Amino acid sequence: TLVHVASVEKGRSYEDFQKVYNAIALKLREDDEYDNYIGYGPVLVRLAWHISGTWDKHDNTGGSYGGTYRFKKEFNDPSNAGLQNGFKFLEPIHKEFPWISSGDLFSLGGVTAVQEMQGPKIPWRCGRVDTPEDTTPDNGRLPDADKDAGYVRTFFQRLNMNDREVVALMGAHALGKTHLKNSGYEGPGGAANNVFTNEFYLNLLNEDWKLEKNDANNEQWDSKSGYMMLPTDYSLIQDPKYLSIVKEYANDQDKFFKDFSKAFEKLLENGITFPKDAPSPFIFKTLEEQGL
Ligand code: HEM
Ligand SMILES: Nc1ccnc(N)n1
């Protein structure tokens, strides 16, 4: 009974949004020291996921539309610890382009980051509209990491995501790292953690994983190379259906890129109704493609 209709920021077109993307991308290129020289790319993708992943398909609460992560209940969710760095990064961009909605900015940061980390193009649509403080979802809607594949499958069905979508989306765990102070997990998933590749899947299959307890007394899978997987990550090689898809993405980066692009756009758009005459989705040029 609750419907969020996309409403284009008044008088804006593709070219305006490309300007915002460019701002984000130039700042990503500039702020390269963050997190031991990873850069802000990974935290921006986690932000776009965590603002979208509060969605509940059953009643259309949560989701990216309302830009509710600007409110303290959501900003202070334990599940979002560390994401304040991404929000602060986006602050000067919102000042430069005050006409953009919060949901549009947060979601566009994620798209920007994937594309500037040499990932696939991710079509993106404008029209999210800030909603009031009382529409902010309660904490507890983002997933736990200390679970098995059954949990992961059930959790993601709330986001209308199926097996292929869940395994595709998880390959964003090639990016960045876990930080003990944020989540009670520590270490990167791979060597190339600010370039978007199929490394997550290759590492799951090819590394020699040992189950260990970390300094916060949580179990994680640790490799002789100094990489980690969360229990939920490692579950993708435990469940038969997931392991098939992991092997597929390990064998074929082009396919992973295609499936990730679709899944991530779907995630970022869950809960939004695009009127049949809205603009077609935007595909933004990278800085490289523009000579910038
Ligand atoms: C079962 C579902 C998931 C669980 C339990 C999970 C859990 C986690 C945890 C615990 C971290 C570490 C946070 C920190 O300590 O800073 C992390 C990081 C990350 N997550 Fe996920 N995640 C899930 C799905 C996803 C999805 C769907 C995406 C995006 C498509 C994503 C993108 C990332 C990124 C890019 C990072 C690295 C952030 C950084 O380096 O600052 N995650 N995730
Ligand atoms: N960087 C990350 C984030 C989450 N999971 C793994 N294995 N690596």
Curated annotation (Swiss-Prot):
Site (Transition state stabilizer): 46
UniProt binding sites for heme b: 173
Function: Destroys radicals which are normally produced within the cells and which are toxic to biological systems.
Assigned EC number: 1.11.1.5
Family the entry assigns: Belongs to the peroxidase family. Cytochrome c peroxidase subfamily.
Keyword tags: Heme, Hydrogen peroxide, Iron, Metal-binding, Mitochondrion, Organic radical, Oxidoreductase, Peroxidase, Phosphoprotein, Transit peptide
EC main group: oxidoreductase
Residues of the full protein shown: 71 to 361 of 361
Modified residue annotations for Phosphotyrosine: 151
Entry PTM: CCP1 precursor is processed by the rhomboid protease PCP1, which cleaves the N-terminal hydrophobic transit peptide. The m-AAA protease (composed of YTA12/RCA1 and YTA10/AFG3) is required for CCP1 maturation: m-AAA protease promotes membrane dislocation of the CCP1 transmembrane segment within the transit peptide to ensure the correct positioning of CCP1 within the membrane bilayer, allowing intramembrane cleavage by PCP1.
GO MF, one annotated term: cytochrome-c peroxidase activity
Biological process according to GO: cellular response to oxidative stress; hydrogen peroxide catabolic process; response to reactive oxygen species
Cofactor note: Binds 1 heme b (iron(II)-protoporphyrin IX) group per subunit.
Additional notes on this entry: Present with 6730 molecules/cell in log phase SD medium.
Designated name of the protein: Cytochrome c peroxidase, mitochondrial
Localization annotation: Mitochondrion matrix; Mitochondrion intermembrane space
Active site as annotated: 50, 189
Cofactor: heme b
